[model samples]
Target chain A: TEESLEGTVIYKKTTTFEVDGYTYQCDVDDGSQFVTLYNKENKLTYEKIVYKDTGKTYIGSWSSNVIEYDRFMSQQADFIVDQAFTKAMADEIGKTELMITMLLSPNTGEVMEVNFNFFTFEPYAKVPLHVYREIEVKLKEQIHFKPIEEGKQLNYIMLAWMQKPQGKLPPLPPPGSL
Target chain B: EESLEGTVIYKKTTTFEVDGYTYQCDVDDGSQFVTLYNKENKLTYEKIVYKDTGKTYIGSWSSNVIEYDRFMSQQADFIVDQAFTKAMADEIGKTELMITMLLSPNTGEVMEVNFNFFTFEPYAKVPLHVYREIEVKLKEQIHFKPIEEGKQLNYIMLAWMQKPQGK
Candidate 1:
């Protein structure tokens, strides 16, 4: 099936922005989905948009506003702690992320199945492995996560997890990475 | 922020085609998920090809009956309101929509709904849209009352039938 193709119909969203006398065009979609959990003095955070249609993603730093990734990452520090990650383990582990597919009730937006791989704990094979049980139980039992915005339903949220060498800020450095 | 060093780790999907459209999940290396519809592809529901595990998961409504009569009786008014008879059903007959849905146990919110219909007479061969419209309404408007505490899989199996109110 390898041959030159002509027209199949590809939908692309393009935007042209002016920057210091220069203009650039690129693909973009829904602008900032208002988030408001981040309140800090000095910090950095990122917003990743994965286009559902094209299956492509581009990342940008949160400029100034209530943030989703920022806020959620900070909150997830509690979850990391719940996994029994010690400061020492944090230093050793540095960073690891879990890719989760969150499915919610069509109407209520209540989580139905937050399908994740067994590999979610692969990075935590040491002190993390033993703690995996707790995480499993937690994911199963926990219901409410982020609040669903009004009149809008969230289908698949492309979420990320990471860590820092040390900080009490947005990307909480594992545990005791300092 | 630009030089944030991260290792390259990716997963490949051992895809299993389920005779439908595949949506690239765009999570990590990404897997595939398809919208479940009837063989005639009549309706839409949930199904997933989770990346991490490279597996396909089909979502289905539960069958356990918790509160059948109480849960279903409440839907009669709304079902009748669908006005299928006026649209395409028999002029003097009635229609019944039999729905089975999977609900979030605690919240009682509908997760997925599968339904079929029956008409009293001449049926006028009521089209699927008549029922599909009501399906959308029921999914959006109905939230079942608490059935069993600490239940994981929840379902409501109810049958509703009626003629137009004026008739």
Candidate 2:
């Protein structure tokens, strides 16, 4: 008796602008969802929503939220690497990847769990397992997670690399910049 | 130092000109309180402020919700709670004023507090002592909610409404 949804809605805002002597329409949630287009004279031009791919052709002007989300994911690794593994360990750690999932609270937006997707380099690290707990602690606390409306749950699942710049998507404004 | 009017209503308008195009916000002033707008075709989203019991109704809002009405109301409520009382209503009198407060960037501490009595004339204002007490109460107690990590607040524009005495 529970409902789950995909793609964490990391950002939400209503914005408007005009372009090319016509009307305009655009919306971005983490700049990871669908896209819409319009032509001059206020005619609807094109519209589509593609969610699975992190790569998006974003031509809008408020990428601040997506950029923040990007930072939210990477800073975990960045902090873990600097404090636990040591940045000097980059050569040894090299290209380790871990599947991570966060179970978000329904009401408080609290990070409930930072469980592993399938287990990766996290177990075999040179540091003690509890020393690696810092990653889970920060993943829970550092993010200002968006609480679900009316008390529903969200599972933010992603594959993360131990290095910086976790995703290929540019930290550009997700929605349009009109 | 700077002046504003009590009767002047602000509908919270924000339109920035960029790249030879104009961007605007469509704000909802109703009970539902939803804002909607779009400029480009790549993305769209909504930022909602839940209408809740903890909410402080806006005296007025500026261009962005970054510094929301709740932020201003808390600052105003603190000053009123500290400064004016029924015992001193005769001295403080009934007057409405606006204060433009600037909070420092990193710590969100009070940087400057400018009081305006809406004085196209003087009698409409609280006495110098009353106003000065408000300044002390305000600057002494409250620290604004930070905007970002290591970043805090900006203008706390408030309608300082004082009616301590009864009819």
Candidate 3:
């Protein structure tokens, strides 16, 4: 028997800033599942994990375990066009049509403003941090965009993402079972 | 030589929080040089590079990049400890006392606060985020398992006892 839960992956796309003048047409990942510790108005002090829509961790510190995070695209004859649109129809995407067709689309070739949900499961207790470390070490040996030195930050974020999933708590394995 | 130059590193010791309960002292090597787009306040988020005190890019980033504590004692010796000399007693030399005693600590000890200043040619620049990432990665490799489990943070602060200027 398995357990599954669901939430919305509210996606937004915009040009966001990074080093120097490099502006990524960011598929910005901002969700209500984010919490923070604030010293005051001037300081962001730190950030914490709350919940996520795509079942992946949020960006930044907890992003190490990010298995996959790439710029999403639209397919030809876009079926889920509501969620995948071009830079045109910002209006129809927000129409309160309340249907899967409203949540996704295949045609119209227009980009969409999105508020959609997805489901995820707490399969195992959040993977241990060391488990993440091992995974990264092995993965980096195989594929690396930036050298370990150049890619440390993104790697760190990926690790954090790995440990972000809240662990599962049910289906006990008959006491002495291990 | 004309364009900007900097180094890459980690943010292991640099703190970050997740949720109200910080995964404190958590370290990672994933950090990079990136500039903040906009400023929140008067904090001169200037071109001041976010140099990581923990990691160094050897001579690649800076010409004469000295390890944070390596130069403290040598820089300290330049100071007149027993009594101030004519030139030493001047305002500029007075600051060395703080540099030796405060800014940078000699005897290879960790202070409550230590200041390490490295010089760079006018046009060179480094990204703070990259340094932060390097520091964090080094921290993770160094401290994989915490000294204690479930402890929100795990940091190894190297503390060395200072020897008082040798008899």
DockQ sort, best first: 2, 1, 3
Task: For each candidate, report what fraction of the true interface contacts it reproduces.
Answer: 0.00, 0.02, 0.00
Candidate 3: tens digits of C-alpha lDDT, residues B1-167 = 11223332222233333333222121212211111111211211111121333331111111211233434433343222322223323322211111111111122222221111112111013223322332233223222121221121111122111111211
Higher-lDDT candidate of 1 and 2? 2
The alpha-carbon lDDT assigned to residue A54 of candidate 3 equals 35
Per-model lDDT: 0.33, 0.34, 0.21
Better by DockQ, candidate 2 or 1: 2
lDDT of 2 by residue, B1-167 (tens): 22222332223234434454333332322211112222331122211122333332222111222243466666566666445444444533433333434454445555444332222222223333444455556666656554432131123222232344311
| Alpha-carbon shift of residue A23 in model 3 (angstroms) | 14
Ranking by TM-score: 1, 2, 3
Higher-scoring candidate on lDDT, 1 or 3: 1
Candidate 1, residues B1-167, lDDT tens digits: the string is: 11111331111222223434221111111111111112332212232223345444222122232454555545645554544543333343433333444455557665554432211122223333444555566667676654542143323233222444321
* RMSD each, Å: 24.4, 22.1, 23.9
Model 1 pairs in collision:
A35-A66, A87-A176
Calculate DockQ per candidate and list them: 0.01, 0.02, 0.01
lDDT of 1 at A49: 41
